[PDB]
């Protein structure tokens, strides 16, 4: 069995990535199943499970496993929402969406790049090259859109900077009577290949994109913050608390102005 959708990528970087730790109940009807790198996350809606991410393509057995270890059946994954489409985010989707039957969700630009399973011609990091697992089976969500499903209602907002299709999703997890707001933040890292100029005219949809996206963490509801690189929004595996989505854009807009500012440098 020579599996194309679960074949490695990036082995070396993959022993920080995908550092074991044990499956977790964040809130309520929400979990961790990822790793020490790399955030997945899994909502039990009582009408089906929904996965957030697939981390790299060997990652998707140890994400099976994870589900199974909170005691639950991967055949109930009923979709699995996409961040981003690059390969330590979205690399065991397909693999997941195949062994699950689940429909994956992204953006309408992120769709793109999940079909590719390549970088898109606008993403900043396009000359690094590379294929990884694409996917076929594909819900688009609009900004703003809510995926209603059991007693859960999920709402896509769309995070661009990272990427033009880069997606943030937020819920409300519960316990008796008492809510929380949780968001699962897309990655705001202004990172790029070696040639790629944020300061260059066409890289303005990628700046104005990063813009809207401290507008839209600035303003969103978020008791928790699960980042998708969870090293970005600090220690452990999520953050709590009045502040943390705009801690967190505070955080990108620091780097973004560091780069701005690199490259204006003679
Ligand atoms: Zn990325
Ligand atoms: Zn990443």
């Given at each position: 069995?020579?599996?194309?959708?679960?074949?490695?990528?990036?082995?070396?970087?993959a022993?920080?990535?995908?550092?074991?730790?044990?499956?977790?109940?964040?809130?309520?009807?929400?979990?961790?199943?990822?790793?020490?790198?790399?955030?997945?996350?899994?909502?039990?809606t009582?009408?089906?499970?929904?996965?957030?991410?697939?981390?790299?393509?060997?990652?998707?057995?140890?994400?099976?496993?994870?589900?199974?270890?909170?005691?639950?059946?991967p055949?109930?994954?009923?979709?699995?929402?996409?961040?981003?489409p690059?390969?330590?985010h979205?690399?065991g989707?397909?693999?997941?969406?195949?062994?699950?039957?689940?429909?994956?969700?992204?953006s309408?630009?992120?769709?793109?790049?999940?079909?590719?399973?390549?970088?898109?011609?606008?993403?900043?990091?396009?000359?690094?090259?590379?294929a990884?697992?694409?996917?076929?089976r594909?819900?688009?969500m609009?900004?703003?859109?809510?995926?209603?499903?059991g007693?859960?209602?999920?709402?896509?907002?769309?995070?661009?900077?990272?990427?033009m299709?880069?997606?943030?999703?937020?819920?409300?997890?519960c316990?008796?009577?008492?809510?929380?707001?949780?968001?699962?933040?897309?990655?705001?890292?202004?990172?790029?290949?070696?040639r790629?100029?944020?300061?260059?005219?066409?890289?303005a949809?990628?700046?104005?994109g990063?813009?809207?996206?401290y507008?839209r963490?600035?303003a969103?509801?978020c008791?928790?913050?699960?980042?998708?690189?969870?090293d970005?929004?600090g220690?452990?595996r999520?953050?709590?608390?009045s502040?943390?989505?705009?801690?967190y854009?505070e955080?990108?807009?620091r780097?973004?102005?560091?780069?701005?500012?690199?490259?204006?440098?003679?």
């Amino acid at each position: 069995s020579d599996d194309p959708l679960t074949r490695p990528m990036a082995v070396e970087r993959a022993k920080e990535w995908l550092a074991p730790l044990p499956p977790e109940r964040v809130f309520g009807n929400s979990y961790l199943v990822g790793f020490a790198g790399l955030s997945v996350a899994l909502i039990d809606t009582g009408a089906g499970l929904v996965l957030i991410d697939g981390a790299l393509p060997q990652a998707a057995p140890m994400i099976l496993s994870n589900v199974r270890k909170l005691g639950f059946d991967p055949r109930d994954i009923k979709f699995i929402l996409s961040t981003e489409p690059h390969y330590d985010h979205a690399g065991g989707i397909a693999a997941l969406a195949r062994d699950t039957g689940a429909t994956v969700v992204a953006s309408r630009r992120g769709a793109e790049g999940l079909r590719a399973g390549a970088h898109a011609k606008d993403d900043p990091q396009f000359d690094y090259g590379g294929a990884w697992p694409a996917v076929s089976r594909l819900r688009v969500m609009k900004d703003g859109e809510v995926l209603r499903i059991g007693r859960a209602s999920i709402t896509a907002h769309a995070t661009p900077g990272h990427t033009m299709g880069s997606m943030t999703w937020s819920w409300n997890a519960c316990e008796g009577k008492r809510c929380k707001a949780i968001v699962f933040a897309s990655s705001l890292n202004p990172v790029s290949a070696d040639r790629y100029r944020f300061t260059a005219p066409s890289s303005a949809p990628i700046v104005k994109g990063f813009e809207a996206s401290y507008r839209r963490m600035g303003a969103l509801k978020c008791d928790i913050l699960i980042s998708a690189h969870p090293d970005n929004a600090g220690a452990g595996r999520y953050g709590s608390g009045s502040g943390a989505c705009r801690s967190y854009a505070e955080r990108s807009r620091r780097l973004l102005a560091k780069r701005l500012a690199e490259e204006r440098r003679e």
